[PDB]
Every structure is written in C-alpha cells, then in structure tokens.
C-alpha cells in the first residue's frame with residue numbers, strides 16, 4: 001500500500017457536493033498538503049459501509065494513475081473512521097452538467113452561450129489524451145462517459161470513475177439481475193452480446209463521448225428505451241451526426257464505431273486527429 005497518507009486534523013469538511021452508494025463527497029480545506037499552498041480546497045469521499053478492500057484497491061490504483069488528464073489523487077485518511085480519499089477539487093463539476101449548462105437548450109473560463117467548435121475540440125482532445133494514458137497502462141475503463149469526467153479552472157477536463165454517476169444518472173444504466181448496472185448506451189455490440197471489455201470497447205465509448213460533446217450532453221439514443229437501444233446497437237445502427245459536428249469529426253467518431261473491434265482506429269490516432277483540429281487556426285476551422 002504505497003499511498004500518501006493525510007492526517008484527519010489537516011482536513012476540515014466545509015459541506016457536501018454529492019452522494020453515492022459507496023460514499024458521500026465533501027468540499028474540504030486541506031492543510032500542509034502542497035508546499036506552495038499552506039491551505040487549499042479538495043474534495044473528500046467518506047467511505048459509507050468487502051467495502052474496505054475496495055477502498056484500499058481504488059486508492060492504490062488512483063496513486064498509480066498520474067497524468068494531466070486523469071483525476072488527481074492526494075491520498076487517504078485511514079486514522080479513525082470514516083476512511084477518506086482526498087482528490088483535486090474540479091470547480092465546474094462533471095463534463096455532462098458543464099456541457100448541458102453551455103449548450104443551446106440552457107463566466108471566468110468560458111464565454112456566454114454555446115461552446116464553439118474550438119472549445120468543443122479542446123475538450124474531446126483532453127478526454128482522448130487521458131484514454132491514450134490508460135491504453136498505455138493496458139487499463140480497461142468500462143464506463144467512459146462525460147458524467148465520469150470533471151472540468152476544472154481553465155477548462156482542464158480529467159477522466160475519473162464515480163459512483164455519484166450510478167445515482168445522479170440512474171437513467172444512463174440498465175440494471176440487470178440483483179445489483180449490476182450497464183452503461184449500455186455507451187457500449188459496443190461485442191461488450192453487450194459477448195460481454196467482452198477491452199481497449200477496443202473503450203475507444204467505442206470514446207466515440208460516444210465525442211457524440212455527447214457535440215450534442216452538448218444529450219443522452220445517446222434518448223428517443224429509445226434500454227431494450228430498444230440494445231436492439232439498435234447489436235443490429236449495427238449508428239448514432240446520427242450532431243448538428244454542431246463537422247463531417248471531419250463525425251469521421252473520427254465513425255472510426256470508433258467500426259463493427260469489428262480490430263477495425264476501430266487506435267486511441268493515439270483519434271487523439272492525433274482531434275489535437276490537430278483543436279490547435280488548427282480559426283481560418284482552417286472556420287471552413288470545417
């Protein structure tokens with residue numbers, strides 16, 4: 001267990017942000033954590049409840065993951081219950097809420113109104129860069145979706161994996177038997193039929209995140225029931241190009257949605273294509 005430990009006295013809870021089945025999330029002041037900042041804000045997950053094994057296991061993984069575009073783990077408070085995981089506080093919450101709150105249907109890091117192509121591409125670009133880092137570590141995510149990404153000051157987007165997600169977005173899961181929840185709207189046919197998850201099922205999910213990003217957080221197949229969508233995805237039927245989405249981008253999506261996992265573009269490729277675009281000049285983009 002090679003996990004940075006934090007003293008409970010150094011953590012002062014301010015108030016709750018969110019609930020999950022495995023814990024509650026608080027904003028907290030943390031002291032003497034970063035040397036530049038003798039004080040500073042974090043988010044703290046108290047463990048609720050087999051559950052303590054999970055927490056130890058999550059912590060170890062969160063320490064190992066280190067990347068500009070994967071959520072940032074400060075360490076744990078094991079001294080006295082409840083157990084606390086401490087994380088970087090992301091001011092703008094989850095990319096879904098953020099996307100919904102700056103899309104046509106509805107300050108400091110963002111202009112008023114619909115995000116423009118340039119911003120949309122910078123987001124997709126950041127989520128792609130994260131997914132490079134995990135495919136690097138041969139780490140299969142299995143629930144990649146905008147709800148599972150946070151936005152910070154500067155529009156820094158980071159990938160995590162939340163349980164607040166299975167509770168706030170009950171509707172993004174299909175409950176099968178007792179206690180299992182499947183993000184079926186985000187899964188490839190091989191994940192659904194054979195129940196096989198891989199890097200290749202992750203890049204399928206990336207394409208769906210791309211569609212989320214350019215639809216300003218609409219749910220994939222919102223017009224379908226969970227069984228209508230399973231029919232739809234197994235039967236090979238692809239999501240429509242969103243209004244705000246240039247054909248050149250719908251192309252990167254399509255490469256994520258090849259029926260045959262092997263035939264899907266690598267995430268390094270998709271990243272390359274999107275970063276290219278995100279950093280192309282307004283004159284190049286303005287005619288996409």
Ligand SMILES: Cc1nc2nc(-c3cccnc3)nn2c(C)c1CC(=O)Nc1cccc(C(F)(F)F)c1
Nearest residue numbers: 025043070071087088089090093159160161162163
């Ligand atoms: C559970 C959780 N909940 C969280 N809420 C917040 C949060 C909320 C509001 C504002 N600012 C931050 N941050 N935050 C983190 C990092 C985790 C850990 C996690 O994301 N766990 C995790 C587990 C497995 C895999 C991964 C990863 F691979 F995707 F990174 C993350």
